[PDB]
């Protein structure tokens with residue numbers, strides 16, 4: 001016999017409101033999602049590198065500091081993989097929950113004053129820009145001080161965390177975009193390449209696009 005370990009969490013109300021705004025909108029410049037996820041990845045890589053400066057054993061889980069983009073037409077997935085710090089279970093639930101809460105509030109006050117939705121990175125919640133293009137987002141992540149986890153939401157008011165039974169990563173994060181049917185251009189090579197070139201030109205880590 002096998003074991004799963006699964007918990008369902010309700011988003012705080014304003015967060016729910018923002019996620020719905022993002023998933024429903026018809027905003028015409030959605031490619032900013034890729035910039036935002038890549039920037040999250042780069043920050044994650046900045047943090048592990050910094051930690052390694054003091055303690056080199058932090059990289060025993062892997063020394064390569066990189067970002068990969070993996071489109072999958074059959075599964076209609078676009079995957080962004082990094083070997084950054086990753087997130088513990090407590091990060092996914094409580095700690096990022098606290099950040100998402102204040103960030104959302106500030107973001108929402110800012111939108112009300114006429115800020116654009118592309119401004120989202122400033123409020124520490126850029127990850128939610130995923131739902132511009134994604135019906136579901138699955139985040140697989142592994143931090144040095146904790147086990148491998150899967151956080152998942154469909155922007156319907158709740159989210160799940162679980163112990164990922166799946167293939168082990170060493171350290172880092174995998175953000176799986178289950179794309180909307182109207183958003184499959186983000187599986188095209190030419191399209192990903194030009195978004196990266198345009199928005200993520202000076203990212204200090206190697207970005208590799210896997211061509212199918």
Ligand SMILES: Cc1cc(C(N)=O)ccc1-n1nc(C(C)C)c2c(-n3cnc(-c4cnn(C)c4)c3)ccnc21
Nearest residue numbers: 040041044092093096097099100124125127139151173
């Ligand atoms: C911080 C982060 C880093 C990376 C990376 N290292 O690639 C990828 C994704 C994310 N994010 N960011 C967030 C929120 C701050 C928006 C996030 C996240 N999360 C989103 N909402 C929550 C939340 C809201 N209420 N509660 C209780 C938890 C956690 C789950 C997984 N990865 C996440």
